[PDB]
Predict the structure.
Amino acid sequence: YHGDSVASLGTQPDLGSALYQENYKQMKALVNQLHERVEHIKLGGGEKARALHISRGKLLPRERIDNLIDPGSPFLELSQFAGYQLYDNEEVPGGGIITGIGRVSGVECMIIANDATVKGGAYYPVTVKKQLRAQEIAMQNRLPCIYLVDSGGAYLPRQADVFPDRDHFGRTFYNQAIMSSKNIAQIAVVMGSCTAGGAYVPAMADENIIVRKQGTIFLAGPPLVKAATGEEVSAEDLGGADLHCRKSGVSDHWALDDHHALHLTRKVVRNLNYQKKLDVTIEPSEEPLFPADELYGIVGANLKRSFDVREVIARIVDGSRFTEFKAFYGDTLVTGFARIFGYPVGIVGNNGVLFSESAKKGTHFVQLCCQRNIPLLFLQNITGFMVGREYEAEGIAKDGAKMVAAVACAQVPKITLIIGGSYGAGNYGMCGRAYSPRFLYIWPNARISVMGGEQAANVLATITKDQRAREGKQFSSADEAALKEPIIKKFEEEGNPYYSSARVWDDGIIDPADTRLVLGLSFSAALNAPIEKTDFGIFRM
Amino acid sequence: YHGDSVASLGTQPDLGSALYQENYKQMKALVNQLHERVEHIKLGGGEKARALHISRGKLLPRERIDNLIDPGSPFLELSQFAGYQLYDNEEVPGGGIITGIGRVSGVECMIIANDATVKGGAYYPVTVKKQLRAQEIAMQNRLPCIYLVDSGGAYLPRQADVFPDRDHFGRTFYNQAIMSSKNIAQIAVVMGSCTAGGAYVPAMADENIIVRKQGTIFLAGPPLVKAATGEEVSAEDLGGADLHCRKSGVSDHWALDDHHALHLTRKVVRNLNYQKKLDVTIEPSEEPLFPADELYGIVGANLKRSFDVREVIARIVDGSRFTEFKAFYGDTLVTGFARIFGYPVGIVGNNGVLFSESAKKGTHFVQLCCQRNIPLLFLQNITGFMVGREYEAEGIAKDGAKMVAAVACAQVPKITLIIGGSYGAGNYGMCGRAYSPRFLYIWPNARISVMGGEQAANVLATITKDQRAREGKQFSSADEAALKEPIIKKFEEEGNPYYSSARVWDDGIIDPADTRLVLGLSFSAALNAPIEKTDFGIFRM
Amino acid sequence: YHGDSVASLGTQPDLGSALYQENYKQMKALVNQLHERVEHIKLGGGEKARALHISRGKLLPRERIDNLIDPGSPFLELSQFAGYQLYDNEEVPGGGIITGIGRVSGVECMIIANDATVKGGAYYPVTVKKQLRAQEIAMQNRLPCIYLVDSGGAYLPRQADVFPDRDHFGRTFYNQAIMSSKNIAQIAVVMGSCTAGGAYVPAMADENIIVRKQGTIFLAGPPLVKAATGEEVSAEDLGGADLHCRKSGVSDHWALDDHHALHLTRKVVRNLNYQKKLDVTIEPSEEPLFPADELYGIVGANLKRSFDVREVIARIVDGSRFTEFKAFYGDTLVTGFARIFGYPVGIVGNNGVLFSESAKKGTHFVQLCCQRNIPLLFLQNITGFMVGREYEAEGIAKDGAKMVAAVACAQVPKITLIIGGSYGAGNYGMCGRAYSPRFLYIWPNARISVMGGEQAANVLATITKDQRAREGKQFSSADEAALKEPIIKKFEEEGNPYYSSARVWDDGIIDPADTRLVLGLSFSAALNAPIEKTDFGIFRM
Amino acid sequence: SRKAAAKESLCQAALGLILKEKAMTDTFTLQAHDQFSPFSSSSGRRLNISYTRNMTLKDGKNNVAIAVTYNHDGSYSMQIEDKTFQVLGNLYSEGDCTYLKCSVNGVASKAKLIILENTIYLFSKEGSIEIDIPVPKYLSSVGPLAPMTGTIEKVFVKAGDKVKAGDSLMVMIAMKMEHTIKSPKDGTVKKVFYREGAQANRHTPLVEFE
Ligand SMILES: *C(=O)CCCC[C@@H]1SC[C@@H]2NC(=O)N[C@@H]21
Ligand SMILES: *C(=O)CCCC[C@@H]1SC[C@@H]2NC(=O)N[C@@H]21
Ligand SMILES: *C(=O)CCCC[C@@H]1SC[C@@H]2NC(=O)N[C@@H]21
């Protein structure tokens, strides 16, 4: 039937209130700062290396992805802020690599493009981290993976941090070997010069493409040949495109220039015989009834004041409709059913500290979402986990452990978004990074640490007051201020969205408004895989 | 192609023949009697209890199901005649409970509503029988189950017949625990007061709904608290809706009144993520070419005269088309292929006593229907199984055993309809009640016993004549009449449709004409489950 | 390693205490009464029918089972007390049928023997109930089933209670048809005269045996032939063993007399190609360190006094060793790990009313036993479920519902033993009859009702005092005594072990001492089936 | 001034609503896998009994209850107050407009049927009638408690005040987290129980409405 009317969420905020004006101004300042930083990261290695990249007839890497995907298609870039002030004097825009999800010939493909304008396309340790993150996104979601190989050797003085470990560079080839055994098609397009470790990236591909007078593959370079043998050889005579397409047989297609290689890539993807099948149910899409500059005004920059998380769920779902589950029992957690772009979503959000009733409500809701095969969207705004003697007497530990067990055993596509603070073990309960969500984005006001700066400063102040009163010396106000400034300063600097997103702890600082669109894009890629049956472990009753 | 023309069944009966007039008049009398009896059962517990039910702001239970299902949807009630003269002075309309299949938010759901106007909604043993029948209908057909809880405690002086056995009251909670492990969603709506055993019916639900100032859940009542403790407590202070939604956490949604609870129920069903998938093939539907007041005239009330079962199959299938399988070999069984409402049906019907050729034809047809995954509709009009010395010499026992083995091993959705007599072990061969059909309806002229009244009277007359002639006393005509009246009287009373349907031996006396529509509704619910592969045992050759 | 020493349970009781002497004397009186009642039930239909059974060269049915099983093998009879004072003037020993588990040719087989000395071997409704219970025991445990057919027709004036329903007589043939599709071998031995409905029991067998001049199969008797046709025929000329082995082909083996038929049965079982495989782990067996006349002294006859259930677990397990799980949290439920006869058992027992902590401990333990594939033995000694306003405020309902869900979803072989009272919905939580245990035995002091006699009498006294004080009349002590005597009398009579075991609500009143041996036998049969993986539903957190 | 609707006009409004619900059912079926199936026909066919739907329409200011019996032949018998009407009809389209074709007690008529949110518009050659569908309480409903155990910074209102919904009543700080209470309810405050600087506990009532 699906025809009767249903009430909807949402409250029109007081746009004249000075709290709204201050929250709106401060969040707008954060978003403008984000805008200008990503416009500086977009240029890449600078105009000198861009001139030397276009003087060899090479398309710039963002132009390569622009000519590769379907015309007019949205591209979802992942981890645009990697390597941001991560090395001391070495400015590495984008990590050196451009990874994202796009629509190629009607198929959602995962694209990995070596930016050669930034330090010769050399692999930094954060470049390997970003690449392995992209490859497990492609394996979780069953996305066909496209590599646009333009390398410059692994970096030498960071070689330890790139070479031997489990999640170091060689894992890349593991990821291409396993994904080929699962029918997830791997295409490599040699547009540059992979050398001596990176030459396995074209050689382990199910179907390969190379470019004449521009693309070289060899396991050993002309310096290594001139040192070990003494035979002078060039690059194109040693591992050029004519040699590889005609004699050795490493490359499978041959391309005149860059546009021909991207055209051939689209042909190879079109002949993959892939047909998308959704097992979830879809309703005709709709729109939120409230705009998202109101999310600028509602949420704001200060983490001291709380807000209602329902005013976020009114702004991001279809029709602003939301079936709230167990609405009065433990209202520091808001769990309900909504739809984004037709997809059914089970939305879990925070409203305060987590009592035991909140953890029981969360465990029940995650079990419902895994029994009905509904995806889960977690929204994190956490302060902590409700300290007190009575609550530890009640067994607040086993209830948080039940929520952690049900979140970790869940097989549905989970997506985390950190709309505020994310501190401590509550971060584990609300499906943080270590619990394998599909995607994890953050907002530019978020903070993430092991505790807040004030919590660390105040428990260290009380503990040192306790041990000095056992000692006997005078612990004054100035000693307390000299005790409290570096703890607050360190937890503020290292809790930033830019500190967390300089690594690949999160998949990217996103704008609040774009939040709605971004979630839809994320969920679309996550529905490219069939949904497995969830089986939980032992619930500690 | 599907375009060429095909001959059809059906003969226009002699409407002027006095046999037609008498058969039509007697079947019309049976159907009018059925009509007035179900209109008396529909009112329920009477006007005094209906006034005291509406004085508390409660919707009457038939109004609850009317406001729960989709607008204009047909409701298929099951077992409307339970408890009909089943207890001595206790008039229990409908068993005390209203079970059926309806269309809620586009999903075929199974609805179980406690009628509180009939003896406080207390559980009689027939109420437990009717409820467990409804729950296995929901489990066979994978129908999501909705309970509208309004109880009054299990009945005390019948407590043995309600409490301990396997298919007594506690089995209900077993059925909700198993069905929740299979993703068959269980919703309970507490509209009344479940007490101390029935409080497990809301507590074992996957998603619960309760009503303020009207719905109470407790494992122990205020008499039990006042006896065991001595603390006076009310109902709402002990187990009310505010206490359960806010402190204890038993209820998941909270409802202002009855209309809000049914609205919330429709929301909960809409967000179940269920999408119906048919594995059978469908053709565009059609109509019978002959009306069903002709079934009144054809079939009639006397079981002595035979009729043609093909004149029934002309009246209930689409287009009156019927591909008859093995039409000459053993024509006391009529087996063929037809379609009802687009669904492909394999129709098995009787025309007389069952010879061995009839059993072989039946075994072959059931094997065809299970190899092609076609449903089966059995029509029972049985006298017996062809006595004689020659037929026992032929092995008529092993042929009936082959039909019983193939009927019992069959995995397709089987539906039985008893259009006439159903006596003895032929009732086992033609898929009676003990062989688990999906639904089993009867017509108001049917009879069902272990043998006919005349068979029992005549074999007992001949056996007692045989033992008196060995004895020597005079066994006259008057002794034979005093021997033959209570056997005939008992087998006539206890073979009735109302005696069989006062228990839950059948799913309901249906009108002949409505027969067509009812079968379509039944088959629709039975196609909500995927069809399993049939594997038979050992065929006694 | 398995070598280090471990503490053990058990306390030597005060054998000189007058409580021990009185408890021992009263339990010894109960066991002697049980002994003399089963020695009267063992004789069967009496000496006149036993003389007329042995005058036709027939072995008596207990002698048939004695010559069928392996020499010296223990026979586990099930439901010896069926039909005990269940019909008014009709004394039906054993129900008319002898069902049990025995060891035939090295295989645990399930044996169903028609006692023909009791009313001609005719089927009473309790005979059908006992037979269908035996057949689902054979299907749960994968035991090959042997029938020793000696019937006399279904009983006529009880024909309704025998014929049409789902779990009436025809279900028997359903059970043989399904079990043959699963490779559970069905042997029928026609030693008597099955007639016209019972003739499907030999005809649906995978391998059949018949006896000359003694065994007749026909779908229609000589009275029915003489009535319908008028042809006089005998029994042996119509359906004798020579006719069926030579012309018709219903029987597969031919036997001279009864000893030859049992010898041929043992041959047929030996050539079944069955090899028992245990998936559980076995340790070398041991003995309890305390005898079980101490269980007479410990447990006694009065249900008012409590005892320790651990003194039962010291008396029935191997070595008196018992790893107690969660021993302090909620000590009104005792859950632990032990071994009986080498088999690993998870033992759950009661010690009082069930608080919410007891239900949480029970749910955790049942989840452990299903994760490790360990069988479960439930010991029931229940008064109730802890009334009070605070406990209903805590949500005691959802905790009992969690225990009911985990008990009902469990796939391990569960065995219930009712060592004391078993009242109300706690009976559902501790795996009573409706939750499908493998076997359910009781002790001769047990009581089972919907509540105790005093609970029913006292809550009805307080409720009627409430309503009379609203009325105004005088409710004196004598009115209260006339109110309290028939409630106590009815709940005492209908809560008996003999009232519960006259039906097939339990598999038999067993001696306390024999309890140990009986459990081992039960568990051995229950390990003839491989253990399935358990998947629970939704735990109401 | 506005004139009251005739009982025949209420029959037409009820029929248009029932047929619009059918239309929604039909367009759901067109997207279903289970096509041609029963349950899709909004016939109201109960087994052995009839189905009567009790609906209420609001005519101006006054409510009228209409009992609609579903007949086997597709007709309706609508009893308004006491008088029964035999009501038949269907929908048809001409271009982009939907028309309701009626026959009430043998009297045929035709009117344009437009249903916008709650209001049923019937445009005929004799006038235009607006019939409203009543809105149930649970779709039109959209005192306060303390969120945690904290100290109150600023009170806002006293007795004799009036706030409207979504108003600041109190601000309380609980373990360094500023919580501004708001009003879901409405009216006038009768008592403020905690003055500024006092300690409020979990789920403790702050203000009251009399
Ligand atoms: C003040 O400086 C902060 C003290 C502790 C932080 C608070 S207490 C309650 C919240 N839960 C938690 O673990 N930390 C938060
Ligand atoms: C006359 O009173 C009836 C005699 C027997 C009934 C007939 S004989 C053939 C049919 N088969 C059967 O078993 N009973 C029917
Ligand atoms: C006295 O006559 C008995 C009163 C109630 C029985 C007691 S109260 C606590 C136990 N739990 C329960 O439900 N019944 C038992």
Summary: Chain B touches chain C through 99 residues (CB under 8 Å). The radius of gyration of chain B is 26 Å. The first strand of chain B starts at residue 76 and ends at 78.
